[PDB]
Design a protein around this motif. Structure first.
Motif, PDB file in Angstrom:
ATOM      1  N   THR A  90       0.860  -1.171   0.000  1.00 17.96           N
ATOM      2  CA  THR A  90       0.000   0.000   0.000  1.00 17.96           C
ATOM      3  C   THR A  90       0.901   1.226   0.000  1.00 17.96           C
ATOM      4  O   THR A  90       2.028   1.208   0.518  1.00 17.96           O
TER       5      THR A  90
ATOM      6  N   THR B 164      -4.672   6.506  -2.085  1.00 17.78           N
ATOM      7  CA  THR B 164      -3.795   5.399  -1.716  1.00 17.78           C
ATOM      8  C   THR B 164      -3.748   4.385  -2.873  1.00 17.78           C
ATOM      9  O   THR B 164      -4.752   4.172  -3.566  1.00 17.78           O
TER      10      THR B 164
ATOM     11  N   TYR C  82      -3.168   0.555  -4.040  1.00 21.30           N
ATOM     12  CA  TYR C  82      -3.370  -0.755  -3.417  1.00 21.30           C
ATOM     13  C   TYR C  82      -2.988  -1.994  -4.204  1.00 21.30           C
ATOM     14  O   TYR C  82      -3.355  -2.135  -5.370  1.00 21.30           O
TER      15      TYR C  82
ATOM     16  N   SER D  59      -7.061   4.585  -5.376  1.00 22.65           N
ATOM     17  CA  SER D  59      -8.400   4.744  -4.822  1.00 22.65           C
ATOM     18  C   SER D  59      -9.214   5.925  -5.368  1.00 22.65           C
ATOM     19  O   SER D  59     -10.427   5.992  -5.142  1.00 22.65           O
TER      20      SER D  59
ATOM     21  N   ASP E  99     -12.281   3.270  -0.861  1.00 17.24           N
ATOM     22  CA  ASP E  99     -11.751   3.078   0.481  1.00 17.24           C
ATOM     23  C   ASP E  99     -12.440   4.044   1.448  1.00 17.24           C
ATOM     24  O   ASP E  99     -12.124   4.088   2.629  1.00 17.24           O
TER      25      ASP E  99
ATOM     26  N   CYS F 198     -11.370  -1.308  -1.835  1.00 20.24           N
ATOM     27  CA  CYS F 198      -9.934  -1.403  -2.054  1.00 20.24           C
ATOM     28  C   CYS F 198      -9.360  -2.610  -1.309  1.00 20.24           C
ATOM     29  O   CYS F 198      -8.307  -3.131  -1.687  1.00 20.24           O
ATOM     30  N   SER F 199     -10.074  -3.065  -0.276  1.00 23.14           N
ATOM     31  CA  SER F 199      -9.674  -4.231   0.511  1.00 23.14           C
ATOM     32  C   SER F 199      -9.484  -5.464  -0.384  1.00 23.14           C
ATOM     33  O   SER F 199      -8.558  -6.266  -0.180  1.00 23.14           O
TER      34      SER F 199
ATOM     35  N   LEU G  81      -6.059  -6.337  -1.726  1.00 27.56           N
ATOM     36  CA  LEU G  81      -4.997  -6.688  -0.793  1.00 27.56           C
ATOM     37  C   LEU G  81      -5.024  -8.198  -0.482  1.00 27.56           C
ATOM     38  O   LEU G  81      -4.345  -8.664   0.433  1.00 27.56           O
TER      39      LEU G  81
END
Length: 130
Positions: free
Chosen positions: A43, A52, A54, A61, A67, A81-82, A85
């Protein structure tokens, strides 16, 4: 997850990235290498505009994922955005395909211009069996 070079190459081929919108697999490998070092949990906060980046492809983002804390942002990939990851990169690959569907294509990432454009990128896929 930190992918090994050939492991990633094979995974991206299976996800249909080879030649997607005219972009060779070696270019996608060069992009992932310079953006995150093949790290899915990478990140990067951009203090200048409050956005951000990602994941493995460092997707921003402001336009691609939501996010909630980025001012005046849209979510074109329609993902939190999770999702970018995760160890499984299916969602990151689908969102990356969306990014390059725009006029700029692969050029949307400045890192690609500085480190991959007009270079011999064969090295990224050599010996991987793809």
């Amino acid at each position: 997850k930190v992918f090994e070079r050939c492991e990633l190459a094979r995974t991206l081929k299976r996800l249909g990235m080879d030649g997607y919108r005219g972009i060779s697999l070696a270019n996608w490998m060069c992009l992932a290498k310079w953006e995150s070092g093949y790290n899915t949990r990478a990140t990067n906060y951009n203090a200048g505009d409050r956005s951000t980046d990602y994941g493995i492809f460092q997707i921003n983002s402001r336009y691609w994922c939501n996010d909630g804390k980025t001012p005046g942002a849209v979510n074109a990939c329609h993902l939190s955005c999770s999702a970018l990851l995760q160890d499984n990169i299916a969602d990151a690959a689908a969102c990356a395909k969306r990014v390059v569907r725009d006029p700029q294509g692969i050029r949307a990432w400045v890192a690609w211009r500085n480190r991959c454009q007009n270079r011999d990128v064969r090295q990224y896929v050599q010996g991987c069996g793809v």
